[PDB]
Design a binder for this molecule. Structure first.
Ligand SMILES: NC(=O)C1=CN([C@@H]2O[C@H](COP(=O)(O)OP(=O)(O)OC[C@H]3O[C@@H](n4cnc5c(N)ncnc54)[C@H](OP(=O)(O)O)[C@@H]3O)[C@@H](O)[C@H]2O)C=CC1
Ligand SMILES: CCOc1ccc(OCC)c(NCc2cnc3nc(N)nc(N)c3c2C)c1
Length: 164
């Protein structure tokens, strides 16, 4: 009944995070992310929660769920869950909960997911051993890809939407 989605931005090289942060600024991607997730449950790993800017934590108008192995973790204004299955239970009757990162939580959620919304960013980031990486999609997914677009930031980006 519920369609579980994943939403992320990556470099063409597959990087989603570096130094505990996102290593670009593409406002158009932030706009997309906001539009995808407004009004829905958003599920995220503990590190992603801690990486959010304090002026958007918890994310407004969304039910925030934070996944940790530590049931005692305190996340003000969010629900803490000990597994993806527990996180999805907190979504309740939300028809389209979203998993919003990071690398570890995407891999946990991927086998439950039926939708992925991906932003690809043309930025010269050579992937390093400590980088947080995007999940790889297999042949079960079918996608449509939008045109490359020029950002007001100067970078080129494009949107992909995958379903199965
Ligand atoms: N470009 C993008 O679209 C986005 C990028 N980011 C970036 O990604 C990075 C964060 O990713 P990552 O470091 O992988 O961290 P995650 O956000 O995936 O958080 C990982 C944490 O999740 C919990 N966890 C992992 N596996 C399990 C499990 N099996 N059961 C219960 N809890 C589990 C643990 O919390 P605990 O240690 O408390 O037990 C672990 O430390 C940052 O750089 C961030 O900026 C984040 C979101 C989107
Ligand atoms: C509702 C506002 O959300 C955010 C605002 C600003 C932010 O950082 C500023 C440096 C945010 N950071 C996390 C974040 C940023 N961009 C993203 N882009 C995409 N496409 N998907 C995400 N999951 C995703 C996430 C989780 C999220």
């Amino acid at each position: 009944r519920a369609e579980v989605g994943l939403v992320w931005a990556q470099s063409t090289s597959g990087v989603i995070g570096r130094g505990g942060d996102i290593p670009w600024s593409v406002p158009e991607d932030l706009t997309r992310f906001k539009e995808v997730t407004m009004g829905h449950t958003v599920i995220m790993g503990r590190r992603t929660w801690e990486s959010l800017p304090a002026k958007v934590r918890p994310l407004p108008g969304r039910r925030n769920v934070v996944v940790s192995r530590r049931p005692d973790f305190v996340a003000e204004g969010a629900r803490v869950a000990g597994s993806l299955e527990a996180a999805l239970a907190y979504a309740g009757s939300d028809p389209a909960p979203w998993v919003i990162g990071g690398a570890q939580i995407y891999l946990l959620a991927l086998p439950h997911a039926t939708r992925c919304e991906v932003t690809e960013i043309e930025i010269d980031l050579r992937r390093d051993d400590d980088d947080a990486l995007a999940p790889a999609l297999d042949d079960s997914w079918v996608g449509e890809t939008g045109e490359w677009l020029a950002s007001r930031s100067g970078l080129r980006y494009r949107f992909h939407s995958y379903r199965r």
